[PDB]
């Protein structure tokens, strides 16, 4: 049983940059033998320090792993587009081997609101006797940011159905989908559907909505 | 080269057994300790364990001690995980790991995920969700997919055959009562729509369901 | 001595033996103990059973 | 008049939750974590193989 | 243990009758007899060494009669 | 070290049955050295009997303390009014002392539904800005029953306080107040004000409701 | 007549002191153990400890070991339960127990609620509470007394001075805001009401406030 | 080439959270719950009082 | 009784695990020992005797640390 923790969570950054991750070995002094993981999505992981001190053969010099036993820094002084990615630091002194919580590579850019597009039910929806409000949150940096379902002013956490995109491949936005599911019945029973979208490029929730009594 | 290759993923049912495969590759089999490491969906790496690759003699940690059995091919140099009694918690990806052993694991079995569940194969419910006054942004009217319902992943959402990539966010399928949800949207000028069809086009292979919902205004 | 209550009643006992009682023993407020396992006994392994 | 307990002694004892972590030959010290909690009582031990 | 190493004897203030009396008294001899008398080929062979070594008559009988309760107790 | 438990938690009887109030000593053997207690609400405990199978002095011969060492039982053959009490039995035989989960007598009778009342904010509280919808459920019996806020059809459990008398004296069924505390903004931004009671006389809630917009 | 005599109900506040007296009477003080328990407000009886009534020895509960002083004066024969570093969990009616020991504690202390938080004195703030054609159920239109906002308890609520107790359930003080509501419901006869006065009469001898509330209909 | 761990050893150690719960003369037995916690290490003992 | 006269030893075939075994070990020496480790008074006063008689040295022990274990429950 020993621990690591590796700090941050995720880092939006500049390509080029440098964007240290920090580690620490919770517990004796790990000395060496901790490394750097890094996963993209959907991956095997990839090794990337070993010893805490040494890269491996693929990973090029820009991945620096350091410190030494009680703490350790996982840095790339150009973090890179082909470095956005999850980073892993595992303790190898003792079994049990384990993994730090991560540190991601986020690219930083321009802060970009959500476009916030709420869809009825589809009258094909409608037919089937269910009922999902969806509204798109799209294309927002960063990925900051809240749903909040109103309905008839009194607002309804239930139903709600969130599927947001990553920082997004061509402007490095994140794009969201927020799903209001009502029964038909309670679609019909109440009127304004009111999903308000809170980003940190809003200083308000930016508000989306439909009464059902309107078209 | 050195290349940790596994089995496929595997949908599951709760109370059954998987064995992950890892195949040993561009090196000696029996020099180096062979790991596995569960990628829980949501979890980071955690490591499931080492089996001794030269007495073929499995460590575990004391999480994954007792329902998983690790187990080592010699001559064709293939490594195995076997979870027994299959929980939805057995649902995750899973990586066998090569060790490097005091240095740790350099490389990683290509991803083995297991999907461990009840729910049967199921067409989704493909909502073309139109936009409303509010809907249109700017010249764009916001367009939209609701794919509903189905097991297992994935259904191919595309848009107009895909010919439209660009305002797309198809949005991520999770989990409803082990069916898959997913709304998909489209952010189209409304000078294209409903001038120009916008169908999305959700085609769940699973299923052998493909689905095609123009978007309609309300 | 100590005043040492077996069963329902109590009972005399120097308290210099009282301690020499080799028994599963007590804080003598609560819980945490002192050879609890001279009450009790193991097995062979057969398999992991024991 | 008044008396107060000195100490106090369990002079039956019931086994709980007998559990057995079995290790491989010469992996040494078993591990089973229940010495982490004293209300359990762990045995290290070996388990005799083919 | 429970069995063994008594309070026996409280032997302060006490005329009175104890908590377990009659035991106490014959604990000794009847167990070491019953062990003994469940052995009775063990009894014989004491009665030699008494003899055996020390030749001085009546202090050789020291040794046996001693050596009859050792055993019990060991 | 040693844990009771005293069963049942009440129990509705017709004055002079025999109720039987169990409790068991969860450690060791007590042997003797268990003792019950009376204690009518708001008063000192009573102690009833002593080595759990000995009447005190005071305490009448209707209760029968009894049980042995790992469990014991308070038997009042004849459970009378002023037998109604918060009954418990405590171990002795080790530091700590402790309790056991208390048992009630409650004098059983015939099921009362409640008589629901519910006053809006009068105009004393509503000249004050607070608004508290309030729901007097007068004299059910039993004392098991749920209060429910709805508002514009959407139920509200907040600003809800809840106060009930006890066992009521001569119907001997129970008395509550059911409270729907609003900001008079919210109090006027909603409109139907209902509390809805469902009681074990009715397989339903009482409904007792009204709207601002109603007188 | 062994009585244990305690001292009253004491207001507090978080990080006083209290010191509970218990007097006892009735027994030659010295021969039996005192016994304090701790009885939460909503919860059962929670055994303090006791203190040797000879030696003036105190020994606490686990729970209660080193906030508090069990202390005795031996002529006055006064028990004390004393509680150091006032925190809202020693608010709770307290028991010295006189200690028929290895038999129980025999007697008990009349009863001391200490009740220990922040607030101030506050007068209660009174609804005549009107009923709607909602509240009158057969000949009885209910009416309510809605107190609201004082501390500390009680406040006195009558009906018209209380010559109605007949329909009248008065509800439990509750806190709000380290304040508290009662709300009294009267039910009286739509004959007797608003024909006759009824008038909850809410008396605080606390923060000194006597009010009247005429309940007249909406 | 491929190794096992027979066992560990804390060359250096870290005292953290000291706490003794202390009980008067002929209280005997001292009573500290962190008996129950073995990342605890507990020790009786006394203070002689005045 | 329970106490003392226990079927161990059986010896009869079994050739096993015992019922209790190691403990049987330890009950002559230890609770002998603990009673004279109790009474170190009788430790100081009772292995003088022997050597006071017979004057025959090596022997002269014989009743003396023999003598010691005698003490205990007789």
């Known amino acids: 049983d020993i621990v690591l923790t590796q700090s941050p969570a995720s880092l939006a950054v500049s390509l080029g940059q440098r964007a240290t991750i920090s580690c620490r070995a919770s517990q004796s002094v790990s000395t060496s033998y901790m490394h750097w993981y890094q996963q993209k999505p959907g991956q095997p992981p990839r090794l990337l320090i070993y010893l805490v001190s040494n890269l491996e053969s693929g990973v090029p010099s820009r991945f620096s792993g350091s410190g030494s036993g009680t703490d350790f820094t996982l840095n790339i002084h150009p973090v890179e587009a082909e470095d956005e990615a999850t980073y892993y630091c595992q303790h190898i002194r003792e079994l049990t081997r384990s993994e730090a919580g991560p540190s991601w590579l986020e690219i930083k850019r321009a802060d970009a609101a959500p476009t916030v597009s709420i869809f009825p039910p589809s009258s094909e929806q409608l037919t089937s006797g269910g009922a999902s409000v969806v509204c798109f949150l799209n294309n927002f940096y960063p990925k900051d940011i809240n749903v909040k379902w109103k309905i008839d002013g009194s607002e309804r956490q239930n139903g709600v159905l969130n599927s947001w995109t990553d920082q997004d491949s061509k402007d490095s936005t994140y794009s969201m989908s927020s799903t209001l599911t009502l029964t038909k019945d309670e679609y019909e029973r109440h009127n304004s559907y009111t999903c308000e979208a809170t980003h940190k490029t809003s200083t308000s929730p930016i508000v989306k909505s439909f009464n059902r009594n309107e078209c | 080269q050195v290349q940790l290759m596994e089995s496929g993923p595997e949908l599951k049912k709760p109370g059954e057994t998987v064995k992950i495969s890892c195949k040993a590759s561009g090196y000696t089999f029996t020099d180096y300790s062979m790991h596995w490491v569960k990628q829980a969906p949501g979890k980071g790496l955690k490591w499931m364990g080492w089996?001794?690759?030269?007495?073929?003699?499995?460590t575990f940690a004391a999480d994954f001690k007792g329902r998983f059995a690790f187990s080592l091919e010699t001559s064709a140099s293939t490594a195995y995980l076997q979870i027994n009694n299959l929980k939805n918690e057995d649902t995750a990806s899973y990586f066998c790991?090569?060790?490097?052993?005091?240095?740790?694991?350099?490389?990683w079995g290509q991803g083995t995920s297991v999907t461990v569940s009840s729910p049967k194969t199921t067409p989704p419910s493909v909502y073309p969700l139109a936009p409303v006054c509010g809907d249109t942004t700017g010249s764009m009217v916001t367009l939209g997919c609701l794919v509903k319902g189905y097991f297992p992943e994935p259904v191919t959402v595309t848009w107009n055959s895909g010919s439209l990539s660009s305002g797309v966010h198809t949005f991520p399928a999770v989990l409803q009562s082990d069916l898959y949800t997913l709304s998909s949207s489209v952010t189209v000028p409304s000078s294209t729509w409903p001038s120009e069809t916008v169908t999305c086009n959700v085609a769940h292979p699973a299923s052998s369901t493909k689905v095609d919902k123009k978007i309609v205004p309300r | 001595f100590y005043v040492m209550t077996v069963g329902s009643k109590s009972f005399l006992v120097h308290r210099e033996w009282f301690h020499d009682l080799a028994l599963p023993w007590t804080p003598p407020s609560s819980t945490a103990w002192r050879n609890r396992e001279l009450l009790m006994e193991f097995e062979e392994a057969h398999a992991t059973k024991q | 008049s008044q008396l107060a307990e000195v100490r106090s002694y369990c002079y039956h004892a019931s086994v709980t939750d007998i559990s057995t972590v079995a290790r491989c030959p010469m992996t040494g010290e078993a591990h089973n974590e229940k010495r982490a909690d004293s209300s359990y009582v762990c045995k290290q031990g070996f388990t005799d193989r083919g | 243990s429970v069995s063994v190493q008594t309070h026996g004897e409280s032997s302060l203030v006490n005329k009175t009758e104890t908590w377990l009396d009659s035991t106490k008294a014959t604990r000794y001899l009847m167990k070491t007899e019953n062990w003994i008398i469940r052995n009775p080929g063990y009894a014989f062979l004491a009665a030699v060494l008494g003899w055996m070594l020390g030749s001085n008559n009546g202090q050789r009988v020291v040794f046996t009669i001693l050596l009859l309760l050792v055993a019990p107790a060991y | 070290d040693i844990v009771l438990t005293q069963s049942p938690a009440s129990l509705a009887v017709s004055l002079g049955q025999r109720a039987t109030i169990s409790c068991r000593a969860s450690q060791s053997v007590s042997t003797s050295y268990m003792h019950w207690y009376q204690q009518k609400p708001g008063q000192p405990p009573r102690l009833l009997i002593y080595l759990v199978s000995n009447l005190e002095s005071g305490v009448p011969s209707r209760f029968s303390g009894s049980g042995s060492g790992t469990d014991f039982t308070l038997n009042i053959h004849p459970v009378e009014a002023e037998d109604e009490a918060t009954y418990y039995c405590q171990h002795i035989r080790e530091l700590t002392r402790s309790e056991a989960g208390p048992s009630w007598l409650e004098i059983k009778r015939a099921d009362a539904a409640p008589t629901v009342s519910i006053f809006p904010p009068s105009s004393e509280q509503l000249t004050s800005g607070g608004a508290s919808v309030v729901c007097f459920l007068n004299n059910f019996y039993p004392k098991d029953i749920n209060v429910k806020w709805k508002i514009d059809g959407s139920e509200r459990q907040n600003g809800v306080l809840n106060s009930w008398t006890d066992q009521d004296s001569k119907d001997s069924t129970y008395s509550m107040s059911s409270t729907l505390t609003l900001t008079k903004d919210e109090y006027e931004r909603h409109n139907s004000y209902t509390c809805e009671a469902t009681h074990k006389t009715s397989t339903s809630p009482i409904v007792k409701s009204f709207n601002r917009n109603e007188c | 007549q062994v009585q244990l005599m305690e001292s009253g109900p004491e207001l507090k506040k978080p990080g006083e002191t209290v010191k509970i007296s218990c007097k006892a009477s009735g027994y030659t003080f010295t021969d039996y153990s005192m016994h304090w328990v701790k009885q939460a407000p909503g919860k059962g009886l929670k055994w303090?400890?006791?203190?040797?009534?000879?030696?003036?020895?105190?020994?606490?509960?686990a729970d209660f070991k080193g906030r508090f002083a069990f202390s005795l004066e031996t002529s006055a024969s006064t028990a004390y339960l004393q509680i150091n570093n006032l925190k809202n969990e020693d608010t709770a009616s307290?028991?010295?127990?006189?200690?028929?020991?290895?038999?129980?504690?025999?007697?008990?202390?009349?009863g001391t609620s200490v009740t220990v938080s922040s607030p101030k004195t506050t007068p209660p703030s009174v609804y005549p509470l009107a009923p709607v054609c909602g509240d009158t159920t057969g000949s009885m239109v209910t009416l309510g007394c809605l107190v609201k906002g004082y501390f500390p308890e009680p406040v006195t609520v009558t009906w018209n001075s209380g010559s109605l107790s007949s329909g009248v359930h008065t509800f439990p003080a509750v806190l709000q805001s380290d304040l508290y509501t009662l709300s009294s419901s009267v039910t009286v006869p739509s004959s007797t009401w608003p024909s006759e006065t009824v008038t909850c009469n809410v008396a605080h001898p606390a923060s000194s406030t006597k009010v009247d509330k005429k309940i007249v209909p909406r | 080439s491929q190794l096992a761990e027979v066992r560990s050893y804390c060359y250096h150690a870290s005292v953290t959270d000291i706490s003794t719960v202390a009980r008067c003369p002929m209280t005997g037995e001292a009573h500290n719950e962190k008996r129950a916690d073995s990342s605890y290490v507990c020790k009786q003992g006394f203070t002689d009082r005045g | 009784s329970v106490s003392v006269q226990t079927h161990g030893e059986s010896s009869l075939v079994n050739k096993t695990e015992t019922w209790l075994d190691s403990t049987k070990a330890t009950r002559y020496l230890m609770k002998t020992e603990n009673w004279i480790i109790r009474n170190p008074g009788y430790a100081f006063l009772a292995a003088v005797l022997g050597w006071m008689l017979g004057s025959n040295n090596g022997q002269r022990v014989v009743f003396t640390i023999l003598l010691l274990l005698v003490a205990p429950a007789y």
């Open positions: 089996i001794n690759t030269g007495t073929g003699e499995p």
């Open positions: 790991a090569r060790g490097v052993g005091l240095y740790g694991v350099d490389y």
